[PDB]
Design an enzyme around this catalytic site. Structure first.
Site, PDB file in Angstrom:
ATOM      1  N   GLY B  17       0.894  -0.923  -0.287  1.00 22.59           N
ATOM      2  CA  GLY B  17      -0.139   0.186  -0.133  1.00 22.59           C
ATOM      3  C   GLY B  17       0.717   1.054  -0.216  1.00 22.59           C
ATOM      4  N   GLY B  20       3.616   1.537   2.297  1.00 21.37           N
ATOM      5  CA  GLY B  20       4.934   0.221   1.958  1.00 21.37           C
ATOM      6  C   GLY B  20       4.407  -1.232   1.556  1.00 21.37           C
ATOM      7  CB  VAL B  22       0.936  -6.302   4.064  1.00 19.74           C
ATOM      8  CG1 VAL B  22       0.712  -6.950   5.604  1.00 19.74           C
ATOM      9  CG2 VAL B  22       0.407  -4.930   3.996  1.00 19.74           C
ATOM     10  CG  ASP B 131     -10.978   2.449   0.646  1.00 20.66           C
ATOM     11  OD1 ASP B 131     -12.205   2.154  -0.262  1.00 20.66           O
ATOM     12  OD2 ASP B 131     -10.264   1.461   0.605  1.00 20.66           O
ATOM     13  CE  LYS B 133      -9.991  -0.987  -2.341  1.00 24.50           C
ATOM     14  NZ  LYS B 133      -9.330  -0.082  -1.938  1.00 24.50           N
ATOM     15  CD  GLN B 135     -11.032  -5.227  -4.538  1.00 28.97           C
ATOM     16  OE1 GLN B 135     -11.730  -4.605  -3.869  1.00 28.97           O
ATOM     17  NE2 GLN B 135     -10.889  -5.242  -5.880  1.00 28.97           N
ATOM     18  CG  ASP B 149      -6.853  -0.866   3.129  1.00 23.81           C
ATOM     19  OD1 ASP B 149      -5.928   0.130   4.674  1.00 23.81           O
ATOM     20  OD2 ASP B 149      -5.940  -0.611   3.141  1.00 23.81           O
TER      21      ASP B 149
HETATM   22  C1  LIG Z   1      -3.075  -5.892   5.209  1.00 19.04           C
HETATM   23  O1  LIG Z   1      -2.679  -6.577   4.503  1.00 19.04           O
HETATM   24  C2  LIG Z   1      -3.075  -8.113   4.830  1.00 19.04           C
HETATM   25  C3  LIG Z   1      -3.659  -7.786   6.003  1.00 19.04           C
HETATM   26  C4  LIG Z   1      -3.446  -9.153   6.235  1.00 19.04           C
HETATM   27 BR1  LIG Z   1      -3.749 -10.305   8.255  1.00 19.04          BR
HETATM   28  C5  LIG Z   1      -3.102 -10.844   5.606  1.00 19.04           C
HETATM   29  C6  LIG Z   1      -3.137 -10.309   3.800  1.00 19.04           C
HETATM   30  C7  LIG Z   1      -3.017  -8.331   3.607  1.00 19.04           C
HETATM   31  C8  LIG Z   1      -2.767  -8.140   2.673  1.00 19.04           C
HETATM   32  O2  LIG Z   1      -1.332  -7.609   2.392  1.00 19.04           O
END
Ligand SMILES: COc1cc(Br)ccc1CO
Ligand SMILES: COc1cc(Br)ccc1CO
Ligand SMILES: COc1cc(Br)ccc1CO
Ligand SMILES: COc1cc(Br)ccc1CO
Ligand SMILES: COc1cc(Br)ccc1CO
Lengths: 262, 302
Positions: B17, B20, B22, B131, B133, B135, B149
């Site tokens: 993101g 940065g 993950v 937000d 969604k 994703q 998120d």
């Molecule tokens: C913050 O993003 C995450 C968090 C977890 Br828990 C699992 C997968 C992701 C994909 O980036």
């Protein structure tokens, strides 16, 4: 309607009630502060009011910053030459939390007259976040007032603005207001604002919502009545200057009542 | 907090993101799989990003099974690491993974119902996600979906004040944001969940706009163009145009044809034009659509 979150307003009020206790500063922190006084804190907070007017920041942001400062000073001993650095970092954090358009860090350095470097501000920013453990969603007097305002029959903008103003006056004086929670000062401020303008009193609807009565509120009301009466002569004058503005309905020009019939 | 980078063994990259990157990591003393979100404060000449200040402060208070758990924050001067519980997949990647099979009604229903619980809990703790969604919705191998998120989230007051207008990814954005309303509330997160409910059934987005006005026009062509009858105040709204084409409302049975009577009732209440009449996450939990809800494990390996 939905803007007053009818399905959530009670859950929210109950939650803030819990969180205000967790976010409360130590009532007796200035005695343990070897180099700073209530008088110095009042100077800092009055400055922060002026800064919020200059950058046209929300009142919520002011209230948050004051919370952060008092909580910080509850555990961190601070030299007087650094009190403004704590305060600047508090207002930056508060701004990033609550504002759509926070002022830039350079703007915060600028308001301190280059007393401090940008590097000093950003490092205190980090220190405050560490001392507060990133707990920045603190209940303020305003969050209580806006809910209380929904119990007006009918809504009066002079009553709203005057309660906002009275609540702001409380931020200036750690003695005595450190001893009262945001929900209680909001209640006092609202009842005092209602009487001064409409002659009306703390409503039962709010006794039902809060559990607070004029008897439970008497101690803060007497303190706030005195603060209102004494405000033209307080050494800090920035909140009265601010509440002369039309944005706030010139409520600082309203005369305090001589008695409260309590 | 009670954590150090030395106890984490990195496993692989799982996401990225503005913040940065993950990473899936493993706790070497406990065995615990975590997601490590790294924030670069070095690229930050303006200190800790406001998005991160909100995400941490808000996730710290939100302890709920259908909200992702922030386990910790490792806080050096150069970097901030967010330690999160590890979930295997996002709902977007699973819908794509069910492309030809379809997602089973019992999982659609358990997913919507857990999403409605986590939303209700965010709303009950004065938090708007802004937000929602596929994703940003995380699933595990046991049958849980969780809201994640929280970088666009906001702590709200009652009544609400004017907040950022650049809010919600376009396909999940509510009309009142599209119409420049001074105020928006918890109903915007419901609009997004309704779009997601439909997407779980179709595995395609309900309003796939290429612009704000196309988004508006696609909503208006599916749900009809709103008048003063259905939505008092709409024609007064800032970005409302009298010249807006006046599309008829099609039978809601045709919006999502495979939905049954109960599903359709609920989708309709989640997609009501008037934010005042739109169903709450709290109220939606009692909807007849959920009389036979269970929590099945996902049907595909993640
Ligand atoms: C913050 O993003 C995450 C968090 C977890 Br828990 C699992 C997968 C992701 C994909 O980036
Ligand atoms: C430099 O003088 C001070 C100090 C403090 Br603390 C707060 C405000 C001011 C006024 O600018
Ligand atoms: C897993 O431990 C990590 C993870 C990340 Br991401 C970056 C650095 C370290 C140090 O060991
Ligand atoms: C009854 O079974 C259904 C119903 C709906 Br709607 C969507 C998916 C399924 C199973 O693939
Ligand atoms: C028995 O459980 C029900 C029944 C009806 Br009707 C609606 C919702 C639920 C929630 O699970």
């Amino acid at each position: 309607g939905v803007n007053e979150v009818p399905d959530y307003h009670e859950d929210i009020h109950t939650y803030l009630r819990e969180m205000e206790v967790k976010c409360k500063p130590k009532v007796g922190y200035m005695k343990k502060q070897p180099d700073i006084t209530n008088s110095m804190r009042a100077i800092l907070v009055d400055w922060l009011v002026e800064v919020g007017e200059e950058y046209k920041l929300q009142n919520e942001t002011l209230h948050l910053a004051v919370n952060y400062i008092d909580r910080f000073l509850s555990s961190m001993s601070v030299l007087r030459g650094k009190l403004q650095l704590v305060g600047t970092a508090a207002m930056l954090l508060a701004s990033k939390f609550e504002e759509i358009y926070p002022p830039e860090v350079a703007e915060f350095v600028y308001i301190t007259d280059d007393t401090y470097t940008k590097k000093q501000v950003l490092r205190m920013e980090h220190l405050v976040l560490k001392v507060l453990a990133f707990d920045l969603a603190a209940p303020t007097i305003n969050q209580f007032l806006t809910q209380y305002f929904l119990h007006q029959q009918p809504a009066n903008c002079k009553v709203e603005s005057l309660a906002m103003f009275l609540g702001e006056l409380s931020l200036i004086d750690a003695d005595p207001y450190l001893k009262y929670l945001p929900s209680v000062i909001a209640a006092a401020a609202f009842h005092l604002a209602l009487y001064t303008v409409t002659g009306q009193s703390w409503p039962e609807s709010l006794v039902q919502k809060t559990g607070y009565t004029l008897e439970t509120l008497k101690p803060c009301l007497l303190d706030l009545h005195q603060t209102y009466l004494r405000a033209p002569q307080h050494a800090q004058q920035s909140i009265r200057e601010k509440y002369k503005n039309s944005k706030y309905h010139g409520v600082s020009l309203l005369n305090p009542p001589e008695t409260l019939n309590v | 907090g009670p954590g150090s980078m030395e106890n984490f063994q990195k496993v692989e990259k799982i996401g990225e993101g503005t913040y940065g990157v993950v990473y899936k990591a493993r706790n070497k003393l406990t065995g615990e799989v975590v997601a490590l979100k790294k924030i670069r404060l070095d690229t930050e000449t303006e200190g800790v990003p406001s998005t991160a200040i909100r995400e941490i402060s808000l996730l710290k208070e939100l302890n709920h099974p259908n909200i992702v758990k922030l386990l910790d924050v490792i806080h050096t001067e150069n970097k901030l690491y967010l330690v999160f519980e590890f979930l295997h997949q996002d709902l977007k990647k699973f819908m794509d993974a069910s492309a030809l099979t379809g997602i089973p009604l019992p999982l659609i229903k358990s997913y919507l119902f857990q999403l409605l619980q986590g939303l209700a809990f965010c709303h009950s703790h004065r938090v708007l996600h802004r937000d929602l969604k596929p994703q940003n919705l995380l699933i595990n191998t046991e049958g849980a979906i969780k809201l994640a998120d929280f970088g666009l989230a906001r702590a709200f007051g009652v009544p609400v004040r004017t907040y950022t207008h650049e809010v919600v990814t376009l396909w999940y954005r509510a009309p009142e944001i599209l119409l420049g309303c001074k105020y928006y509330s918890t109903a915007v997160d419901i609009w997004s969940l309704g779009c997601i409910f439909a997407e779980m059934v179709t595995r395609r987005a309900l309003f796939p706009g290429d612009s704000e006005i196309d988004q508006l026009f696609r909503i208006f062509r599916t749900l009809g163009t709103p008048d003063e009858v259905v939505w008092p105040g709409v024609t007064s709204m800032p970005d409302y145009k009298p010249s807006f084409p006046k599309w008829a409302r099609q039978d809601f049975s045709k919006v999502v044809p495979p939905l049954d009577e109960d599903g359709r009732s609920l989708l309709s209440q989640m997609l009501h034009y008037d934010p005042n009449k739109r169903i709450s996450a709290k109220a939606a939990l009692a909807h007849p659509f959920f009389q036979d809800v269970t929590k099945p494990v996902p049907h595909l390996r993640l």
